[PDB]
Amino acid sequence: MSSSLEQALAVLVTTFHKYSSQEGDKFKLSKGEMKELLHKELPSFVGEKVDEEGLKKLMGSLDENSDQQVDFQEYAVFLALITVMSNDFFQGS
């Protein structure tokens, strides 16, 4: 049976495809699509238990480059960055 981390990675893949399937190459999504994804699929990037500033700016940079295509590995980079900016494990220092 599937391990907890296998299941988590599976969900990273299906969430990616939920968006990547919508235009063009199914193995890509645009930075604009990724911004949509982060809005819709994750909790709020506002408040004192997250790096609100870092998250604001990360999201704004996705705007600046909305047409640029992102692969799965890059998507995971962005997810990892947001996770570090939002998860108490990291923000508690």
Check residue 2 for interaction with a copy of itself (CB under 8 A): yes
Instruction: Give dist(CA 20, CA 87) in Å, integer.
Output: 25
3-state secondary structure (DSSP) of residue 29? strand
The amino acid at residue 2 is S
Q: Which does 28 bind (CB under 5 to 8 A by kind): a copy of itself, Na ion, none?
A: Na ion
Please name the residue that has the structure tokens 């692969």. Answer: 71
Contact flag: residue 24 with Na ion (CB under 5 A): yes
69 close to 28: Cβ distance less than 8 angstroms: yes
Q: Which stretch binds a copy of itself (CB under 8 A): 28-36, 47-55, 60-68, 70-78?
A: 70-78
69 marked as part of a ligand binding site:
yes
- Residue 72: other Cβ atoms inside 10 A: 15
Residues flagged as binding site for Ca(2+)? 28, 33, 63, 65, 67, 69, 74
Binding-site residues, in ranges, read: 28, 33, 63, 65, 67, 69, 74
| Residue ranges that bind Na ion, judged by CB under 5 A | 20, 23-24, 28-29, 39, 42
